[PDB]
């Protein structure tokens, strides 16, 4: 009933490597709605970036909205479906 999920972040070219290194690994219960799992990842992303907000501001990143922005999680086939390997983007595929 639990699956190990590893995320490749495609949120923002300026910070995806930091998120890939710090907050990419998750354990997810099989029946979790993808929309609920997305909020778990978003929470972890904000916790990871808020401590370096003084570096992000001059890189042109405002974290204000990120907390409430919609995060899209999808699998290698671009489907909104829990998988061992998933992508995180602010934009749906299509």
Swiss-Prot record:
Residues 2-94 form the Ubiquitin-like domain. It is found in: Host endoplasmic reticulum membrane. It is a multi-pass membrane protein. Inhibited in vitro by GRL-0617. May form homohexamers. Interacts with N protein. Responsible for the cleavages located at the N-terminus of the replicase polyprotein. Participates together with nsp4 in the assembly of virally-induced cytoplasmic double-membrane vesicles necessary for viral replication. Antagonizes innate immune induction of type I interferon by blocking the phosphorylation, dimerization and subsequent nuclear translocation of host IRF3. Also prevents host NF-kappa-B signaling. In addition, PL-PRO possesses a deubiquitinating/deISGylating activity and processes both 'Lys-48'- and 'Lys-63'-linked polyubiquitin chains from cellular substrates. This is Papain-like protease nsp3. It comes from Severe acute respiratory syndrome coronavirus 2.
